[PDB]
Amino acid sequence: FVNQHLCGSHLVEALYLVCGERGFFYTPKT
Amino acid sequence: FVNQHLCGSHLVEALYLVCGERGFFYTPKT
Amino acid sequence: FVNQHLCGSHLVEALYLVCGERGFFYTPKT
Amino acid sequence: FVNQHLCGSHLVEALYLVCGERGFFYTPKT
Amino acid sequence: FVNQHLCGSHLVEALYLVCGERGFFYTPKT
Amino acid sequence: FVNQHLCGSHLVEALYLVCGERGFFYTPKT
Amino acid sequence: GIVEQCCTSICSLYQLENYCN
Amino acid sequence: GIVEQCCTSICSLYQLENYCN
Amino acid sequence: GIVEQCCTSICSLYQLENYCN
Amino acid sequence: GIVEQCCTSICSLYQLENYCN
Amino acid sequence: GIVEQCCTSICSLYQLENYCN
Amino acid sequence: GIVEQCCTSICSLYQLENYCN
Ligand SMILES: [Cl-]
Ligand SMILES: [Cl-]
Ligand SMILES: [Zn+2]
Ligand SMILES: [Zn+2]
């Protein structure tokens, strides 16, 4: 895998693909 | 607004939209 | 709901999620 | 180009791609 | 069709829509 | 990580994620 | 859970807020 | 409409232009 | 307009909803 | 091919790397 | 190349189509 | 955090995986 530059909803897509059925939590600063 | 089927990446994109900075959890196992 | 920072196709995704079956019109300047 | 099934958010993403600054309407009720 | 300003994964979406069943190759610099 | 169904634009988004600068080919005819 | 509420069955944007932090 | 033309049945990028403003 | 505002500034879903049909 | 491996059947992120250049 | 051009500048769908298989 | 790091800098899928449930 390569490093990622992910903003906004693209981070959420990536988490989705990475975590699959485990799901994930999305916790931005502030 | 409306009710639609939101699945998979689309569901998490909707969560991102709706929660934004609050963050959210996507826990499909539930 | 939180405020949104939406560019490009992300605005269209958001309109899609917001409007659902009503659909929507996308009308950029110029 | 090609013909494929374009549904939901994917359909509006395609409209955004194809229309861009012209804008477009997505009116699924029709 | 209109000209496109496409970064990151948006380019890949566009290639996908443009190429359909032909598929495509995505070859960034470096 | 996980195994999920990755189809269509989602498949190419996953390839973009996983390959990034290496680039990739999407050749559904195979 | 969210998948049953929003994917399998349908949910509003408001119901989606149930899954915000 | 567009859903029938492009989702239910298939449409080209050119047909999609039918829905531009 | 809304397209510019959401991108250069911020916009709310409620503002977005004005663009629904 | 990739569609059979990853869409029709399921594949890991590692299998997806099979299609990188 | 195309990846850079579409992002730093603009590119057309016709230019994109050159990357189809 | 990860949300900021992936956007302002870069992040890896392995770092992302830490946010899975
Ligand atoms: Cl973006
Ligand atoms: Cl889908
Ligand atoms: Zn984007
Ligand atoms: Zn989809």
CSV table of C-alpha atoms and ligand atoms in Angstrom, one decimal:
chain,number,residue,atom,x,y,z
A,1,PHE,CA,0.0,0.0,0.0
A,2,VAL,CA,1.0,3.6,-0.7
A,3,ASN,CA,0.6,6.6,1.6
A,4,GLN,CA,-2.5,8.6,1.3
A,5,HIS,CA,-3.5,12.2,1.1
A,6,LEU,CA,-7.1,12.3,2.2
A,7,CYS,CA,-9.3,15.1,2.9
A,8,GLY,CA,-12.9,15.5,3.8
A,9,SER,CA,-15.1,12.7,2.7
A,10,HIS,CA,-12.2,10.9,1.0
A,11,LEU,CA,-10.9,10.0,4.4
A,12,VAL,CA,-14.2,8.5,5.3
A,13,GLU,CA,-14.2,6.5,2.0
A,14,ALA,CA,-10.8,5.2,2.9
A,15,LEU,CA,-11.8,4.2,6.4
A,16,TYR,CA,-14.7,2.5,5.0
A,17,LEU,CA,-12.5,0.4,2.6
A,18,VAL,CA,-10.0,-0.2,5.2
A,19,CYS,CA,-12.3,-1.3,8.0
A,20,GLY,CA,-15.0,-3.1,6.0
A,21,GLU,CA,-17.4,-4.9,8.3
A,22,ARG,CA,-15.6,-3.8,11.4
A,23,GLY,CA,-16.7,-0.3,10.7
A,24,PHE,CA,-14.8,2.5,12.2
A,25,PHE,CA,-15.1,5.8,14.0
A,26,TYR,CA,-14.5,9.1,12.4
A,27,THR,CA,-13.3,11.7,14.9
A,28,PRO,CA,-12.0,15.0,13.5
A,29,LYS,CA,-10.4,17.6,15.8
A,30,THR,CA,-12.8,20.1,17.3
B,1,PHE,CA,-35.5,16.2,3.6
B,2,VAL,CA,-36.1,12.6,2.5
B,3,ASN,CA,-35.6,8.9,3.4
B,4,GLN,CA,-33.6,6.8,0.9
B,5,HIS,CA,-31.5,3.5,1.1
B,6,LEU,CA,-28.0,4.5,2.1
B,7,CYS,CA,-25.6,1.6,1.9
B,8,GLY,CA,-21.9,1.0,2.2
B,9,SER,CA,-19.7,3.8,1.3
B,10,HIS,CA,-22.8,5.9,0.6
B,11,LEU,CA,-23.9,5.4,4.1
B,12,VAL,CA,-20.7,6.6,5.5
B,13,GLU,CA,-20.6,9.5,3.1
B,14,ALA,CA,-24.0,10.5,4.4
B,15,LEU,CA,-22.8,10.2,8.0
B,16,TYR,CA,-19.9,12.4,7.2
B,17,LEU,CA,-22.3,14.9,5.7
B,18,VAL,CA,-24.7,14.8,8.5
B,19,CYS,CA,-22.2,14.6,11.5
B,20,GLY,CA,-19.2,16.4,10.0
B,21,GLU,CA,-16.9,17.7,12.8
B,22,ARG,CA,-18.9,15.9,15.6
B,23,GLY,CA,-17.6,12.8,14.0
B,24,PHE,CA,-19.5,9.6,13.9
B,25,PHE,CA,-19.3,5.9,14.2
B,26,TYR,CA,-20.1,3.4,11.6
B,27,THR,CA,-20.7,0.1,13.3
B,28,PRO,CA,-22.4,-2.2,10.9
B,29,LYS,CA,-22.2,-5.3,13.3
B,30,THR,CA,-24.2,-2.9,15.1
C,1,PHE,CA,-26.8,19.0,11.0
C,2,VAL,CA,-23.4,20.7,10.7
C,3,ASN,CA,-22.4,23.3,8.2
C,4,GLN,CA,-20.7,22.0,5.1
C,5,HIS,CA,-17.7,22.8,3.0
C,6,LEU,CA,-18.4,21.3,-0.4
C,7,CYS,CA,-16.7,21.7,-3.6
C,8,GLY,CA,-17.0,20.2,-6.9
C,9,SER,CA,-18.8,16.9,-7.1
C,10,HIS,CA,-19.1,16.8,-3.3
C,11,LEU,CA,-21.8,19.5,-3.6
C,12,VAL,CA,-23.7,17.3,-6.0
C,13,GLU,CA,-23.4,14.3,-3.6
C,14,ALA,CA,-24.8,16.5,-0.8
C,15,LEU,CA,-27.7,17.7,-2.9
C,16,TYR,CA,-28.4,14.2,-3.9
C,17,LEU,CA,-28.6,13.1,-0.2
C,18,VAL,CA,-30.5,16.2,0.8
C,19,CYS,CA,-33.1,16.1,-1.9
C,20,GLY,CA,-33.6,12.3,-2.4
C,21,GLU,CA,-36.4,11.5,-4.7
C,22,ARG,CA,-37.3,15.2,-5.2
C,23,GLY,CA,-34.0,15.5,-7.1
C,24,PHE,CA,-32.5,18.9,-7.4
C,25,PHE,CA,-31.0,21.4,-9.8
C,26,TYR,CA,-27.3,22.1,-9.9
C,27,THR,CA,-26.6,25.6,-11.1
C,28,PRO,CA,-23.1,26.9,-10.8
C,29,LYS,CA,-22.2,30.5,-11.6
C,30,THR,CA,-21.1,31.1,-15.2
D,1,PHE,CA,-17.4,6.5,-24.9
D,2,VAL,CA,-19.7,3.8,-23.4
D,3,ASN,CA,-23.3,3.0,-22.0
D,4,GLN,CA,-23.5,1.7,-18.4
D,5,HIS,CA,-26.1,1.7,-15.6
D,6,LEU,CA,-25.8,5.0,-13.7
D,7,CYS,CA,-27.9,5.1,-10.6
D,8,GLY,CA,-28.3,7.3,-7.6
D,9,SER,CA,-25.4,9.3,-6.5
D,10,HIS,CA,-23.5,7.8,-9.4
D,11,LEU,CA,-26.0,9.2,-11.8
D,12,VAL,CA,-25.7,12.7,-10.4
D,13,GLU,CA,-21.9,12.4,-10.3
D,14,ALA,CA,-22.0,11.5,-14.0
D,15,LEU,CA,-24.3,14.5,-14.7
D,16,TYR,CA,-21.9,16.8,-12.8
D,17,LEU,CA,-19.1,15.4,-15.0
D,18,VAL,CA,-21.0,15.7,-18.2
D,19,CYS,CA,-22.7,19.1,-17.7
D,20,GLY,CA,-20.3,20.8,-15.3
D,21,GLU,CA,-20.7,24.6,-15.4
D,22,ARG,CA,-23.8,24.4,-17.5
D,23,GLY,CA,-25.4,22.8,-14.5
D,24,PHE,CA,-28.1,20.2,-14.7
D,25,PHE,CA,-31.2,19.0,-13.2
D,26,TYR,CA,-31.7,15.7,-11.6
D,27,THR,CA,-35.5,15.0,-11.6
D,28,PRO,CA,-36.1,11.3,-10.9
D,29,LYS,CA,-39.9,11.8,-10.7
D,30,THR,CA,-39.1,12.7,-14.1
E,1,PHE,CA,-19.1,17.9,-22.7
E,2,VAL,CA,-17.3,20.5,-20.6
E,3,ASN,CA,-13.7,20.6,-19.5
E,4,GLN,CA,-12.9,19.0,-16.3
E,5,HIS,CA,-10.9,19.9,-13.2
E,6,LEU,CA,-10.2,16.6,-11.6
E,7,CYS,CA,-7.9,15.7,-8.8
E,8,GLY,CA,-7.2,12.6,-6.9
E,9,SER,CA,-9.9,10.0,-6.9
E,10,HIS,CA,-12.2,12.3,-9.0
E,11,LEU,CA,-10.0,11.6,-12.0
E,12,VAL,CA,-10.4,7.9,-11.5
E,13,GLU,CA,-14.2,8.3,-11.2
E,14,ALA,CA,-14.1,10.2,-14.4
E,15,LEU,CA,-12.0,7.6,-16.2
E,16,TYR,CA,-14.4,5.0,-14.9
E,17,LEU,CA,-17.4,6.9,-16.4
E,18,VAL,CA,-15.6,7.6,-19.6
E,19,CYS,CA,-14.2,4.2,-20.3
E,20,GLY,CA,-17.0,2.0,-18.9
E,21,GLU,CA,-16.5,-1.6,-19.8
E,22,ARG,CA,-13.3,-0.9,-21.7
E,23,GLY,CA,-11.7,0.0,-18.3
E,24,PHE,CA,-8.7,2.2,-18.3
E,25,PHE,CA,-5.3,2.6,-16.9
E,26,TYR,CA,-4.4,5.2,-14.3
E,27,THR,CA,-0.8,6.3,-14.5
E,28,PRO,CA,0.2,9.3,-12.4
E,29,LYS,CA,3.6,10.8,-12.7
E,30,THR,CA,6.3,9.4,-10.4
F,1,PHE,CA,-7.9,-5.3,6.8
F,2,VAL,CA,-11.1,-6.9,5.3
F,3,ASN,CA,-12.7,-8.5,2.2
F,4,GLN,CA,-15.8,-6.9,0.8
F,5,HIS,CA,-17.6,-6.6,-2.6
F,6,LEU,CA,-16.1,-3.8,-4.5
F,7,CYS,CA,-17.9,-3.0,-7.7
F,8,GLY,CA,-17.8,-0.4,-10.4
F,9,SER,CA,-16.7,3.0,-9.4
F,10,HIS,CA,-16.1,1.7,-5.9
F,11,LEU,CA,-13.7,-0.8,-7.2
F,12,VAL,CA,-11.7,1.8,-9.0
F,13,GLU,CA,-11.8,4.0,-6.0
F,14,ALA,CA,-10.4,1.2,-4.0
F,15,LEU,CA,-7.6,0.6,-6.6
F,16,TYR,CA,-6.8,4.3,-6.5
F,17,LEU,CA,-6.5,4.0,-2.8
F,18,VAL,CA,-4.5,0.9,-2.8
F,19,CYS,CA,-2.1,1.6,-5.7
F,20,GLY,CA,-2.0,5.4,-5.6
F,21,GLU,CA,1.1,6.8,-7.4
F,22,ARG,CA,2.0,3.3,-8.7
F,23,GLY,CA,-1.1,3.6,-10.8
F,24,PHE,CA,-3.2,0.7,-11.8
F,25,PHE,CA,-5.2,-0.8,-14.5
F,26,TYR,CA,-8.9,-1.5,-14.4
F,27,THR,CA,-9.6,-4.1,-17.1
F,28,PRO,CA,-13.0,-5.5,-16.4
F,29,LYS,CA,-13.0,-7.6,-19.7
F,30,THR,CA,-10.2,-8.9,-17.8
G,1,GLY,CA,-28.1,-1.0,13.6
G,2,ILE,CA,-27.3,1.7,11.1
G,3,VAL,CA,-27.2,-0.8,8.2
G,4,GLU,CA,-30.6,-2.2,9.1
G,5,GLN,CA,-32.1,1.3,9.7
G,6,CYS,CA,-30.6,3.1,6.7
G,7,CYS,CA,-29.5,0.6,4.1
G,8,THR,CA,-31.8,-2.4,4.5
G,9,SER,CA,-34.7,-0.1,5.5
G,10,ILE,CA,-34.6,3.6,4.8
G,11,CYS,CA,-33.8,6.4,7.1
G,12,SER,CA,-33.9,10.1,7.1
G,13,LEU,CA,-30.9,12.5,7.5
G,14,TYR,CA,-32.2,13.0,11.1
G,15,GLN,CA,-32.1,9.3,11.8
G,16,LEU,CA,-28.6,9.4,10.5
G,17,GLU,CA,-27.7,11.9,13.2
G,18,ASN,CA,-28.2,9.1,15.6
G,19,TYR,CA,-24.8,7.9,14.7
G,20,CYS,CA,-22.9,11.1,15.2
G,21,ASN,CA,-20.6,11.5,18.1
H,1,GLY,CA,-36.9,10.1,-17.2
H,2,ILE,CA,-33.2,10.1,-16.4
H,3,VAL,CA,-33.6,7.2,-13.9
H,4,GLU,CA,-35.3,5.1,-16.5
H,5,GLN,CA,-33.0,6.1,-19.3
H,6,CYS,CA,-29.7,5.8,-17.4
H,7,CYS,CA,-30.2,3.6,-14.3
H,8,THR,CA,-32.9,1.2,-15.1
H,9,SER,CA,-31.8,1.1,-18.7
H,10,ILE,CA,-28.3,2.3,-19.8
H,11,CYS,CA,-27.4,5.5,-21.4
H,12,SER,CA,-24.4,7.1,-23.0
H,13,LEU,CA,-22.5,10.2,-21.7
H,14,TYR,CA,-24.2,11.9,-24.7
H,15,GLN,CA,-27.7,11.0,-23.5
H,16,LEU,CA,-26.7,12.3,-20.1
H,17,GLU,CA,-26.1,15.7,-21.7
H,18,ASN,CA,-29.9,15.7,-22.2
H,19,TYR,CA,-30.2,16.7,-18.6
H,20,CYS,CA,-27.8,19.6,-18.6
H,21,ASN,CA,-29.0,23.1,-18.4
I,1,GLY,CA,-24.7,31.2,-5.7
I,2,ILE,CA,-24.9,28.0,-3.7
I,3,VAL,CA,-22.3,26.2,-5.7
I,4,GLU,CA,-19.8,28.9,-5.0
I,5,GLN,CA,-20.9,29.6,-1.4
I,6,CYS,CA,-20.6,25.9,-0.3
I,7,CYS,CA,-17.1,25.8,-1.8
I,8,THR,CA,-15.6,29.2,-0.9
I,9,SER,CA,-17.4,29.5,2.4
I,10,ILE,CA,-19.7,27.1,4.1
I,11,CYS,CA,-23.3,26.2,3.6
I,12,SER,CA,-25.9,24.3,5.5
I,13,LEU,CA,-28.0,21.3,4.5
I,14,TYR,CA,-31.0,23.6,5.0
I,15,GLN,CA,-29.6,26.0,2.3
I,16,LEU,CA,-29.0,23.0,0.1
I,17,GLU,CA,-32.6,21.9,0.5
I,18,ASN,CA,-33.6,25.0,-1.4
I,19,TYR,CA,-32.2,23.5,-4.5
I,20,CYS,CA,-34.4,20.5,-4.4
I,21,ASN,CA,-37.2,20.2,-6.9
J,1,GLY,CA,-10.4,-10.7,-13.6
J,2,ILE,CA,-10.7,-7.9,-11.1
J,3,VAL,CA,-14.5,-7.8,-11.4
J,4,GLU,CA,-14.8,-11.5,-10.7
J,5,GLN,CA,-12.3,-11.4,-7.9
J,6,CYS,CA,-13.5,-8.3,-6.2
J,7,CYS,CA,-17.0,-7.5,-7.2
J,8,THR,CA,-18.6,-10.8,-8.0
J,9,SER,CA,-16.6,-12.5,-5.3
J,10,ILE,CA,-14.8,-10.6,-2.5
J,11,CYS,CA,-11.2,-9.6,-2.3
J,12,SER,CA,-8.9,-8.1,0.2
J,13,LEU,CA,-7.0,-4.8,-0.2
J,14,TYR,CA,-3.9,-7.0,-0.7
J,15,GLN,CA,-5.6,-8.7,-3.7
J,16,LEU,CA,-6.5,-5.4,-5.0
J,17,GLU,CA,-2.8,-4.6,-5.2
J,18,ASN,CA,-2.6,-7.2,-7.8
J,19,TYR,CA,-3.9,-4.6,-10.2
J,20,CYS,CA,-1.4,-1.9,-9.5
J,21,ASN,CA,1.2,-1.0,-11.9
K,1,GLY,CA,0.6,13.5,-17.8
K,2,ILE,CA,-3.2,13.3,-17.7
K,3,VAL,CA,-3.3,12.8,-14.0
K,4,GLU,CA,-1.4,15.9,-13.4
K,5,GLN,CA,-3.0,17.9,-16.2
K,6,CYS,CA,-6.6,17.3,-15.1
K,7,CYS,CA,-5.7,18.4,-11.6
K,8,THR,CA,-3.3,21.4,-12.2
K,9,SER,CA,-5.1,22.5,-15.3
K,10,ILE,CA,-8.1,21.1,-17.0
K,11,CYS,CA,-8.7,18.3,-19.2
K,12,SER,CA,-11.5,17.1,-21.4
K,13,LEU,CA,-13.4,13.8,-21.5
K,14,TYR,CA,-12.0,13.3,-24.9
K,15,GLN,CA,-8.5,13.5,-23.5
K,16,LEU,CA,-9.6,11.1,-20.7
K,17,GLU,CA,-10.9,8.6,-23.3
K,18,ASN,CA,-7.3,8.1,-24.5
K,19,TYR,CA,-6.7,6.2,-21.3
K,20,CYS,CA,-9.3,3.7,-21.9
K,21,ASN,CA,-8.2,0.2,-22.7
L,1,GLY,CA,-5.5,13.5,14.8
L,2,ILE,CA,-5.9,11.2,11.9
L,3,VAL,CA,-8.5,13.3,10.2
L,4,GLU,CA,-6.1,16.2,10.2
L,5,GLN,CA,-3.0,14.2,9.5
L,6,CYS,CA,-4.3,12.5,6.4
L,7,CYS,CA,-5.4,15.8,5.0
L,8,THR,CA,-2.5,18.2,5.9
L,9,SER,CA,0.1,15.6,5.6
L,10,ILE,CA,-0.1,12.0,4.5
L,11,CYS,CA,-1.2,8.9,6.3
L,12,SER,CA,-1.0,5.2,5.6
L,13,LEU,CA,-3.8,2.6,5.4
L,14,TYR,CA,-2.1,1.0,8.4
L,15,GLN,CA,-2.6,4.2,10.4
L,16,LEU,CA,-6.2,4.3,9.1
L,17,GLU,CA,-6.8,0.7,10.3
L,18,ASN,CA,-6.3,1.9,13.9
L,19,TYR,CA,-9.7,3.6,13.6
L,20,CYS,CA,-11.6,0.5,12.8
L,21,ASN,CA,-13.8,-0.9,15.5
M,1,CL,CL,-11.8,16.9,-3.2
M,2,CL,CL,-23.8,1.0,-5.4
M,3,ZN,ZN,-13.0,15.0,-3.7
M,4,ZN,ZN,-22.2,3.4,-5.2
